[PDB]
Amino acid sequence: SYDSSSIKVLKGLDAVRKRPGMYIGDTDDGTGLHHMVFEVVDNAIDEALAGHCKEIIVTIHADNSVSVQDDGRGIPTGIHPEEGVSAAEVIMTVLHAGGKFDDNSYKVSGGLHGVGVSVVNALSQKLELVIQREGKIHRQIYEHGVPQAPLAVTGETEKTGTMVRFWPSLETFTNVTEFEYEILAKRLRELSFLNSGVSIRLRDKRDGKEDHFHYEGGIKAFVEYLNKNKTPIHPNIFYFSTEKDGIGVEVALQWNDGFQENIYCFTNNIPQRDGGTHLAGFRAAMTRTLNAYMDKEGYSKREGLIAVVSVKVPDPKFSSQTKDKLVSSEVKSAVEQQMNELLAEYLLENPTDAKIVVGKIIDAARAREAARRA
Amino acid sequence: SYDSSSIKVLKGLDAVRKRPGMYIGDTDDGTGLHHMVFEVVDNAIDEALAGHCKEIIVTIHADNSVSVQDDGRGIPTGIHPEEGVSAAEVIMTVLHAGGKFDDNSYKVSGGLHGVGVSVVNALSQKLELVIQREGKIHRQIYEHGVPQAPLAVTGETEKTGTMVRFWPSLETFTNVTEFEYEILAKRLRELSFLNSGVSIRLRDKRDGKEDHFHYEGGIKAFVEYLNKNKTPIHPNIFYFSTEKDGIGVEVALQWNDGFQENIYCFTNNIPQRDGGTHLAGFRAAMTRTLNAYMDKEGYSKREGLIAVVSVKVPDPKFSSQTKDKLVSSEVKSAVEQQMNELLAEYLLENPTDAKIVVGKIIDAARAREAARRA
Numbered sequence: 204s205y206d207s208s209s210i211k212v213l214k215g216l217d218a219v220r221k222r223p224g225m226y227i228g229d230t231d232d233g234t235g236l237h238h239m240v241f242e243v244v245d246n247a248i249d250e251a252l253a254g255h256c257k258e259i260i261v262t263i264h265a266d267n268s269v270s271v272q273d274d275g276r277g278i279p280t281g282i283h284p285e286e287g288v289s290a291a292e293v294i295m296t297v298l299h300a301g302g303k304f305d306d307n308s309y310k311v312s313g314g315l316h317g318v319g320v321s322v323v324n325a326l327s328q329k330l331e332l333v334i335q336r337e338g339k340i341h342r343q344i345y346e347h348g349v350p351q352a353p354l355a356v357t358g359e360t361e362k363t364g365t366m367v368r369f370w371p372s373l374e375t376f377t378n379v380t381e382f383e384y385e386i387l388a389k390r391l392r393e394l395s396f397l398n399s400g401v402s403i404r405l406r407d408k409r410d411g412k413e414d415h416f417h418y419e420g421g422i423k424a425f426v427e428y429l430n431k432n433k434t435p436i437h438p439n440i441f442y443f444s445t446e447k448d449g450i451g452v453e454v455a456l457q458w459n460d461g462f463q464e465n466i467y468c469f470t471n472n473i474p475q476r477d478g479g480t481h482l483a484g485f486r487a488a489m490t491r492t493l494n495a496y497m498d499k500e501g502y503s504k505r506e507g508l509i510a511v512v513s514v515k516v517p518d519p520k521f522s523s524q525t526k527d528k529l530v531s532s533e534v535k536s537a538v539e540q541q542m543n544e545l546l547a548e549y550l551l552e553n554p555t556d557a558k559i560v561v562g563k564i565i566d567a568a569r570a571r572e573a574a575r576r577a
Numbered sequence: 578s579y580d581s582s583s584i585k586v587l588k589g590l591d592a593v594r595k596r597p598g599m600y601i602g603d604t605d606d607g608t609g610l611h612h613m614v615f616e617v618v619d620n621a622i623d624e625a626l627a628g629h630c631k632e633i634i635v636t637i638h639a640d641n642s643v644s645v646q647d648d649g650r651g652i653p654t655g656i657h658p659e660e661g662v663s664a665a666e667v668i669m670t671v672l673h674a675g676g677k678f679d680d681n682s683y684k685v686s687g688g689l690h691g692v693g694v695s696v697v698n699a700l701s702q703k704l705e706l707v708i709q710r711e712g713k714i715h716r717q718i719y720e721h722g723v724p725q726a727p728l729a730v731t732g733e734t735e736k737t738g739t740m741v742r743f744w745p746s747l748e749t750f751t752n753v754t755e756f757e758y759e760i761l762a763k764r765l766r767e768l769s770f771l772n773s774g775v776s777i778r779l780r781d782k783r784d785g786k787e788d789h790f791h792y793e794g795g796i797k798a799f800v801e802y803l804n805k806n807k808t809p810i811h812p813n814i815f816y817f818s819t820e821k822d823g824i825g826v827e828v829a830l831q832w833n834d835g836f837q838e839n840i841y842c843f844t845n846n847i848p849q850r851d852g853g854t855h856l857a858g859f860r861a862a863m864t865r866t867l868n869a870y871m872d873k874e875g876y877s878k879r880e881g882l883i884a885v886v887s888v889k890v891p892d893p894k895f896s897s898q899t900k901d902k903l904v905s906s907e908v909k910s911a912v913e914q915q916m917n918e919l920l921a922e923y924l925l926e927n928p929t930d931a932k933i934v935v936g937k938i939i940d941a942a943r944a945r946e947a948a949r950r951a
C-alpha cells in the first residue's frame with residue numbers, strides 16, 4: 204500500500220508544471236503571469252549589465268503572447284557537449300543550467316539560479332526563440348516546453364540578439380490570463396533609471412499604445428520621479444555611487460512632507476520587496492549619521508523618506524527563490540560604511556537641507572508626544 | 578569569450594549547495610539552519626496526518642547534530658526501478674522525488690515539492706538514516722549528500738519508523754551555527770495542538786533539558802494557550818471543524834483586551850506567515866457576519882483578536898517555495914462559507930460574548946475618532 208512503487212521522480216520541466224508556485228509564484232492573481240515576462244526581461248537586463256545590450260523591446264501581442272527583443276550577444280547556439288544538443292535548448296529545457304553560476308560571462312547579474320526562462324518555457328503552451336549570433340539567424344519552437352525541432356540556421360545577419368515570445372499555458376494560469384500594460388510599464392520605467400543608456404521600448408499591439416523609456420538621470424532622477432507628486436521639502440537629493448571591496452553601492456534619497464516610508468532596494472537590479480542586508484545597512488547608517496549631526500548641532504536627546512538603494516554584488520545570496528530579501532552579510536557592512544561616510548559629508552555641505560530634514564523628524568516626534576492627552 | 582562552453586549544468590544536489598537560498602533560506606541568521614530540522618519534522622508530521630505515526634522525538638545532540646525519530650511506516654527501502662537503487666536513496670539524492678505528488682500515500686501532506694529532505698542531505702556534512710520497515714532495520718550514511726554505501730539490512734524488528742540525524746555543513750551555514758532549544762520548541766508545541774493524540778518529545782543532550790508535548794484540546798486549546806498571558810475579555814472560544822467539498826476547515830478564535838492582531842494560518846500544518854486565500858476568507862466572513870449582527874441588534878453604521886485557521890487541502894498551491902502564502906483559490910470560498918454559517922450561529926447562541934466583542938470593536942473606533950482634537 205506504500206512502498207518503492209509509491210515514489211515518483213519528476214523529470215525535465217514536469218516539476219515546474221506540477222508545482223508552479225515553487226518557481227513562478229501565484230498562478231491565479233496575475234503576479235506569476237506577469238513574472239513570466241520579468242524573468243525574460245531580467246535576462247535581457249543582464250546582457251545590459253555586462254555592457255552588451257543597449258536596446259530592449261517588449262511587445263504585448265494581440266494573441267495574448269508577449270515578446271522581448273534584445274540586442275545582446277545572443278543565447279549560445281553551438282552543440283553542448285555532455286547534453287548533446289544546442290546550448291540554447293539546454294537552457295530552455297534544463298533546470299539549473301546557465302552561465303551566471305560563475306563570473307566568466309556576467310561579472311554581475313540578476314540571474315543566478317539557472318531556472319527562470321526554463322520556467323517560462325515550461326508554463327508556456329508555445330514558445331518561439333530567435334537567436335542572432337556568429338553571423339547566423341537561428342530559430343526554434345517549443346510547445347509546453349518541448350522542442351518541436353532542433354535549433355536551425357534560417358538566414359545570415361551581422362546583428363546580435365535574442366528574441367523570446369511566449370504564449371502562457373492556460374492549463375496553469377487562471378483568473379488573470381491577460382497582460383496588463385501598466386504592470387509591465389512600471390517595472391520597465393524603473394529599469395530605465397537603473398540602466399542608463401539602454402533604450403527600453405514597450406509595445407501594446409492590442410491598442411497601438413507605446414512607450415520608450417530612456418531616462419538619463421540614473422537613480423537620482425528615479426528619486427525625483429518618485430517625489431514628482433508629493434512635495435519635496437528640500438532641494439538637494441543625496442546621491443552617491445561607489446564600488447569598493449567588490450561591492451557596488453548606489454543610493455539616492457530625498458524627503459517629502461507626507462507621512463509614508465518608501466525605500467526601494469535592489470540587488471543587480473532585482474527588487475527586494477522585503478529588504479535585507481542592504482536595507483539594514485542603510486538604516487543603521489541613517490540613524491548613526493543623523494544622531495551625530497544632532498549631537499554636534501546641540502539638539503538634546505522614517506516619515507517622508509523616499510530612497511533608492513541599489514547594489515551590485517558578484518555572488519548574491521537571497522533568502523528565498525523569489526529574491527525578495529538579500530542575505531549576503533558583507534552587504535550590510537558595505538552600505539553602512541559608505542552611507543556613514545557620504546551622508547555625513549552630504550549634511551555638512553548642505554546644512555540648509557540638513558536642518559529641514561531633522562526639523563521634520565523632530566516635528567513628528569512632537570506630534571505623537573502631543574497625544575499625551577489622556 | 579561567451580559560447581556553449583559558458584553554459585554549465587548543475588547535477589544531483591550540487592544546485593542546492595550552490596544556491597541554498599533557493600531551497601533552505603537564509604544561511605546566516607539561523608532561520609535556514611532551523612528550517613533544516615523543520616523539513617524533517619514536517620515529513621514525520623505527514624506520516625501522522627495519514628494515521629501512521631503517533632510518536633515523534635527530536636533530539637539536539639552534543640555534537641551539534643539533530644535527530645528526528647518517528648514511528649511512522651518508514652521510508653520505502655526496496656529497489657527503485659528506473660533509478661536502480663533503494664527508494665530511500667532516491668528520495669535523499671534526487672530533487673523532485675517523493676510520494677506526495679499524488680494522493681495514494683498521503684491523502685494530505687505538508688510536503689508537495691519532493692525536495693525537502695533532499696535539501697537537508699545536501700546541506701549536511703553528515704547524514705544518518707535508519708529505517709524500520711518490512712521486519713528489517715535498514716541503515717545508510719551520507720556525507721555532503723553522497724551515499725558512502727548502499728542501504729543495508731542490519732537487524733530484525735517488528736517496529737516501524739524512520740530516524741534521520743544530520744550534521745549541518747558549515748561550508749554553508751554561517752554566524753548562527755548552533756541549534757536553539759526555544760525555536761524548535763515553539764514549533765513543536767504548536768504542532769502538538771495541530772496534531773492531537775501524537776506525542777512529540779524534544780530532547781537536548783547539551784544540558785539534559787526535555788519536553789513532552791501532547792496537549793489534547795486541539796486548536797481550541799491552542800487559542801487558550803495564546804491568550805494565557807493577555808486577558809481574554811470573553812469566556813467562550815469560537816471553534817469548529819468541518820470537511821466539505823474536499824476541504825478541511827478548522828477555526829478557533831477569541832479576543833483579549835490588548836491591541837494586537839494575531840491570526841495564525843496553516844495548510845496541512847505548514848504555517849503561512851503571509852496568509853493567503855484562507856486568511857482572506859476568514860476576514861471576509863468575519864466582517865460580513867459581524868455587520869449583519871450589528872444591523873440586527875440596531876447598531877448604526879482586528880484589535881485584540883487571536884485566531885487559528887488551519888486547513889486541510891489535498892493539493893494545495895502556494896505562491897512560493899517557502900509555502901508562506903496559500904493561493905488555492907477554492908480555499909477562500911471554503912473558509913468564507915463555513916465561517917459565515919458558524920460564526921453567525923456562534924453569536925446567536927452566545928449573545929453575551931457577542932455584545933462584548935462588538936463593544937470592543939466599537940470602543941476602538943471611539944478612541945481613534947477622539948483624535949479629532951486638531
Ligand SMILES: Nc1ncnc2c1ncn2[C@@H]1O[C@H](COP(=O)(O)OP(=O)(O)O)[C@@H](O)[C@H]1O
Nearest residue numbers: 246301302303314315316317318319320321365
Ligand atoms: N537574452 C539572453 N541573452 C543571452 N543569454 C541569455 C539570455 N537569456 C538567457 N540567457 C542564458 O540562459 C541562462 C539560463 O537562463 P535562465 O534559465 O533564465 O537562468 P539564469 O539567468 O538563472 O542563469 C542565462 O544564465 C544566460 O546564460
Ligand SMILES: Nc1ncnc2c1ncn2[C@@H]1O[C@H](COP(=O)(O)OP(=O)(O)O)[C@@H](O)[C@H]1O
Nearest residue numbers: 620675676677688689690691692693694695739
Ligand atoms: N519520515 C518519513 N516517513 C515516511 N516517508 C518519508 C519520511 N520522510 C520522507 N519521506 C518520503 O520522502 C519523500 C520525499 O521527501 P522530501 O524530499 O522531504 O519531499 P516531499 O515531502 O516534498 O515529498 C516524501 O514525500 C515521503 O514519501
Ligand code: BEF
Nearest residue numbers: 315316317318319
Ligand atoms: F534567472 Be535565474 F533562474 F536566476
Ligand code: BEF
Nearest residue numbers: 689690691692693
Ligand atoms: F517537502 Be517537500 F519538498 F514539499
Ligand SMILES: [Mg+2]
Nearest residue numbers: 246314319320
Ligand atoms: Mg534568468
Ligand SMILES: [Mg+2]
Nearest residue numbers: 620688693694
Ligand atoms: Mg518533505
